[PDB]
């Protein structure tokens, strides 16, 4: 197991994790927008 | 600029298949992770599939084993194969790279699935 | 296009994306704090 | 300071930052769930 | 699949020490950042410690210098040494990699600290 | 420890220019992405500009083409050139690396822009 294999596997883990953190943010941004609409309605 | 040119949508019957394409310019698909998204009318944009720089994949739960993301490095193009389509898959489908989602979206490709 | 060029470009994408995910979090943390203040006021 | 040293240090920064962005998300997901419970109770 | 087999918990007196182990299969611990979490009854899961691919560490504030994460690359195992334990450290402790926390959790190892 | 020593602020007229400096110790600026932030009185801290390890840049929308982040690797120093300043740019400006923003902030450098 070379240094480049370690770097590649770290980069791959990071990219997979970044996509998951983005998905979680989008879910939470929808939830916050729903609360904001509830507190803002007439 | 980055150019994203989506194609391969259309009208398909339920249980049918599509292969979407996004032809990319201004970044290399073999260097950058690339994402497919979809947006149904009046709903929030949903991430559908991702392919990492070194070729790992992940899918939203709604894909549930039906979708396959891939790329051609020579054509600098990202693909989404979609099998066993359902009416609930009707949406406009978009490809992007994560660093540009705050910046630019292409026109997308319309997918309509009818029973 | 070498392996090192691919790694460098992946790292660069990741760092740009991390800064954007941080900015989005800060925006959402302000929004949540504003809701918390609204639900906590006398 | 070689190119590989630069790549390694970038990867290490990114991994540390990803763990912090995850922790912040978990804190904010608890806060949003608490607000959602407050707006949903009988 | 990824396998996570946690051990080393038990019943310990306050001021005592434990060393937790997580034996990993299906990913390499010298390639992937690895995390320890804990979950007390009825509470949200808390990140405790992280070790990066190249061996940097960080700890939650609740560890406050008491905990040490490490790994053995040959045994593909991650460790958490926990010194000067307190009743407030009672929880089930879990190891994971960040890309799988949406997907799978092992059984954990129960830690109970009594005065 | 990491040391962050900000300078180059002051009182400047609208339409004027500044060049901020942050002299860094304990991490290398040619290895780490580095960020500039600002904080106006009673407001939340705002990210202004980022430079990645390999030299890509991005800016907040409030910079709108006026700001340029750069670094000197030998002096281990990060710079923010700010052109066509406006009263709304009045704030304390801070440099940091993303992994330390939960941990430590320097004193910053005060920027005041008057008409």
- Here the CATH number for the domain that contains residue F78 is 2.60.40.10
- Taking the Cβ of residue F21 and every Cβ of chain D, the question of whether any pair is shorter than 8 Å is answered with no
Q: Report whether B54 contacts A5 (CB < 8 A).
A: no
Q: Spell out which chain D residues touch chain F, with contact meaning CB-CB distance below 8 angstroms.
A: 1, 5-6, 9-10, 13, 16-17, 20
Report how far residue B10's alpha carbon sits from residue B112's, in angstroms, rounded to the nearest whole number: 6
The B3-7 sheet, strands edge to edge:
B3-7, B18-25, B77-82, B67-72
Q: Report whether F106 contacts F5 (CB < 8 A).
A: yes
Query: Please, is B55 exposed, middle or buried when counting C-beta atoms within 10 Å of its C-beta (0-12, 13-18, 19+)?
Result: exposed
Report how far residue C36's alpha carbon sits from residue A36's, in angstroms, rounded to the nearest whole number: 11
Domain that holds residue E17: 3-114
Instruction: Quickly tell me which residue has 């940097």 as its tokens.
Output: E56
Q: Which of C15, B94, B63, D24 is nearest to A24 (CA)?
A: D24
Instruction: Quickly tell me which residue has 């923010």 as its tokens.
Output: F80
Report how far residue B48's alpha carbon sits from residue B37's, in angstroms, rounded to the nearest whole number: 5
Facing residue for C7 by CB, picked from D7, D17, D38: D7
Chain C residues whose beta carbon lies within 8 Å of the beta carbon of residue D7: 4, 7-8, 11
Residues near C37 by Cβ (< 8 Å), separated by ≥ 6?
Answer: none
H helices of chain C, in order, are 3-40
Q: How far is C25 from chain F (nearest CA, A)?
A: 11
Residues near F50 by Cβ (< 8 Å), separated by ≥ 6?
Answer: C15, C16, C19, F33, F34, F35, F36, F57, F58, F59, F69
Q: Report whether D25 contacts E47 (CB < 8 A).
A: no
Structure tokens belonging to residue A37: 């609409």
Q: Is the dihedral of CA F93, F94, F95, F97 positive or negative?
A: negative
- Taking the Cβ of residue C7 and every Cβ of chain A, the question of whether any pair is shorter than 8 Å is answered with yes
Report how far residue F48's alpha carbon sits from residue F111's, in angstroms, rounded to the nearest whole number: 14
**Substitution target from B32, B34, B50, B99 for chain A, most A beta carbons within 10 A:** B50
H helices of chain E, in order, are none
**Following DSSP, what letter does each residue of E57-74 receive, concatenated?**
EEE-TTTTT-EEEEEETT
Facing residue for D11 by CB, picked from A7, A17, A35: A7
Q: Which of E51, E48, E1, E9 is nearest to E27 (CA)?
A: E1
Cα atoms in the 13 Å half-sphere on the side-chain side of F72: 9
Which chains reach chain E with 3 or more Cβ–Cβ distances below 8 angstroms?
Answer: A, D
Q: Which of B22, B2, B19 is nearest to B95 (CA)?
A: B22
- Taking the Cβ of residue D15 and every Cβ of chain A, the question of whether any pair is shorter than 8 Å is answered with yes
Entry resolution (Å): 1.6
Structure tokens belonging to residue F35: 């960020």
Q: How far is A15 from chain B (nearest CA, A)?
A: 6
Number of domains in chain E: 1
Facing residue for F56 by CB, picked from C12, C23, C30: C12
Interface of C with A in 17-36 (CB under 8 A): 17-18, 21, 24-25, 28, 31-32, 35
The E46-51 sheet, strands edge to edge:
E10-13, E109-114, E91-96, E34-39, E46-51, E57-59
């Amino acid at each position: 197991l070379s240094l480049l294999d370690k770097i590649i596997g770290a980069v791959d883990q990071i990219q997979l994790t970044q996509a998951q953190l983005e998905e979680r943010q989008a879910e939470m941004e929808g939830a916050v927008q729903s609360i904001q609409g509830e507190l803002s309605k007439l | 600029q980055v150019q994203l040119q989506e194609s391969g949508g259309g009208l398909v019957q339920a249980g049918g298949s599509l292969r979407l394409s996004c032809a990319v310019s201004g970044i290399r698909v073999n260097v950058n992770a690339m994402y497919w998204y979809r947006q149904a009318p009046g709903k929030q944009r949903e991430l559908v599939a991702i392919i990492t720089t070194f070729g790992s994949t992940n899918y939203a739960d709604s894909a549930k084993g039906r979708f396959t993301i891939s790329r051609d490095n020579t054509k600098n193009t990202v693909y989404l194969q979609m099998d066993n389509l359902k009416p609930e898959d009707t949406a406009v489908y978009y490809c992007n790279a994560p660093q540009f989602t705050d910046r630019y979206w292409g026109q997308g490709t319309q997918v309509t699935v009818s029973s």
